[PDB]
Design a protein around this ligand. Sequence first.
Ligand SMILES: NC(=O)c1ccc[n+]([C@@H]2O[C@H](COP(=O)([O-])OP(=O)(O)OC[C@H]3O[C@@H](n4cnc5c(N)ncnc54)[C@H](O)[C@@H]3O)[C@@H](O)[C@H]2O)c1
Ligand SMILES: NC(=O)c1ccc[n+]([C@@H]2O[C@H](COP(=O)([O-])OP(=O)(O)OC[C@H]3O[C@@H](n4cnc5c(N)ncnc54)[C@H](O)[C@@H]3O)[C@@H](O)[C@H]2O)c1
Lengths: 333, 333
Amino acid sequence: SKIGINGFGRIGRLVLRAALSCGAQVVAVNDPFIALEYMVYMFKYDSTHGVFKGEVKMEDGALVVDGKKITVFNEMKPENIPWSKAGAEYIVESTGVFTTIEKASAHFKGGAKKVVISAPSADAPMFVCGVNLEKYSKDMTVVSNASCTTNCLAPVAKVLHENFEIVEGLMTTVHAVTATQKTVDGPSAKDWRGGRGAAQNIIPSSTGAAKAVGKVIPELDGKLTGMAFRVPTPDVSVVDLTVRLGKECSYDDIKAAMKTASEGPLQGFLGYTEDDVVSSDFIGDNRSSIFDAKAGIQLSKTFVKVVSWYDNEFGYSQRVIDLLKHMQKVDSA
Amino acid sequence: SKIGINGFGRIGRLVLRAALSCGAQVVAVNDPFIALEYMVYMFKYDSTHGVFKGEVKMEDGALVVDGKKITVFNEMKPENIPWSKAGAEYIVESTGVFTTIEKASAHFKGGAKKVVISAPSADAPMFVCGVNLEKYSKDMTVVSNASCTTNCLAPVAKVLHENFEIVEGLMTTVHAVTATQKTVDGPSAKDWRGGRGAAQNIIPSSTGAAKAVGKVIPELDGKLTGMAFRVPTPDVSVVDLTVRLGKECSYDDIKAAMKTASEGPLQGFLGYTEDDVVSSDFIGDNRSSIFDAKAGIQLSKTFVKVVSWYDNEFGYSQRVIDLLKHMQKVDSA
Ligand SMILES: NC(=O)c1ccc[n+]([C@@H]2O[C@H](COP(=O)([O-])OP(=O)(O)OC[C@H]3O[C@@H](n4cnc5c(N)ncnc54)[C@H](O)[C@@H]3O)[C@@H](O)[C@H]2O)c1
Ligand SMILES: NC(=O)c1ccc[n+]([C@@H]2O[C@H](COP(=O)([O-])OP(=O)(O)OC[C@H]3O[C@@H](n4cnc5c(N)ncnc54)[C@H](O)[C@@H]3O)[C@@H](O)[C@H]2O)c1
């Protein structure tokens, strides 16, 4: 394609990494609070996933990724930052704060052209590879890729709602740690989630599963809402989902619905292991939304329980890249 | 006496809790980030060491810590922040930045007088219990309380030296705790110490061991040096040591010298016990530096290896307080 990145730190690494092996092309990297030498060791060496490969070294004004000429920009606040340099018309922002068109688009001034991001957003285009279909078209400057939780779910709905329709359902996600969770105990910050923890506590926490879903698959777009529980589980996570249903259920029926369908188009999204209680392995299995039958599956007529999953950290990597290609083609096509 | 604190965070809780039960009088803590309501829940709230009795509450812009009317100060930078104002005559300091007369006296600025600090202090009076003896006189306005490690350590010498003089001492800490260590993997900041962990991956690193020890009896100063190992362990900690000396030995012999002497002057510092290898229990055992014969022991005549215990969180506290009383009385005199 041809792109650059906000935040060498988690999501990025792969974006860069996946874009390289996974998808493709060339670029540049934007990270004040991480320097040249670092980019190398850092991106190369990561606790969750293992190590890199290739060569993680800097030569000429920059870092050499499988020699695919790459660079680092220090800058705080995109504007400040070039981006013009290299010509990375398609940009991926991990970030945190940076949510919404302004700052996103702002990016443009410094350079940019198209912007697609890691994280939900109230104002601005919202997306994911699952149901995205026709949604995104040239009209577009910027778009977003559903949260770790969100992207995973959108898929689940499809076969359940479309095939089973769906009325009234709620949820929880037992999760693997994000940047935000701290060691020992102490302060915290916004929306709180009491930042008292790490190794000691199973921590209650919330989310925008509804909104995201709805917009990803409106119809739904209200018939859902959610919350969550964080554990020391560093990398990787699973979700529990609840629903009531019009067409009558058979646990045999459901997991199958997904399976057959699963086979289908969806691919980078789906899964279905009858296999057997896999904890949280995945973690670089190489799967998008990926679910299973049995697990803690349970059944009755109009009411049922289902559970799918995540391998967030990474998994998100592949559908941003997934989109970047869709995006790429779409726009310039 | 009369005190105030730099940053409601770890040490402080106790700093205060203790000073409250253990020592006394009262205070007002300093912190732009940590707020009013916040404080009470926070302090009162620690899975690690526990939950507080009495009651932690916010009134007329003050915290009611076991009644004893209390103040909270919102300033970034001491100088900036009042002191005297609230009647805070002695001031302990909970940070690394602030270490040294520069910022130190600063507190004086706002309105202090006596300063006492969590952590070593190359520039300025430095100290520990055992050796702290006469050392501390009105002469000084500010003194530094050694690191978690160091205080636990200084104990070693005392016995090793007087017991065997000693011409060669070295060491290793099985450590845990401290924020910097970030979840998963990323930046970290100055000095390296790789904040590349938590649960997965242990982290090499060095600090306050040999070097400092000296001031608490330089005699030894030189015949020593140190480095440390950190486990995902939240709180508690163990030190290992090695030395060669003037002899007359047996692991039995040694523990005995320390035991007897242990009882002796030192008491609230030292120990012995036994209990095979006990464990990292001592998480609020209720003692300073505490060691054990058995735990682990190795022997070769003019050379042996030993181990000790320092519950950093809870431990250092008693000792700083321990000093707050000494200091106090010391100067007023
Ligand atoms: N962490 C996950 O597992 C995960 C999963 C899915 C989505 N996300 C999304 O990723 C984003 C952050 O997650 P991450 O762990 O991959 O990020 P990260 O915190 O590891 O990235 C932040 C780092 O990027 C660099 N950076 C670039 N621009 C910066 C700026 N303006 N200010 C400060 N630092 C800047 C700095 O090195 C900074 O420390 C969030 O939007 C989050 O919702 C994260
Ligand atoms: N952690 C230990 O086990 C241990 C043991 C002995 C000594 N110490 C000493 O404690 C200090 C840090 O360790 P800790 O975890 O016990 O402390 P903490 O990090 O975890 O305490 C820091 C607190 O100060 C606040 N703060 C932030 N910026 C500040 C500023 N500019 N001025 C004042 N307060 C500010 C923070 O918000 C937080 O509440 C170091 O000086 C260290 O040498 C720690």
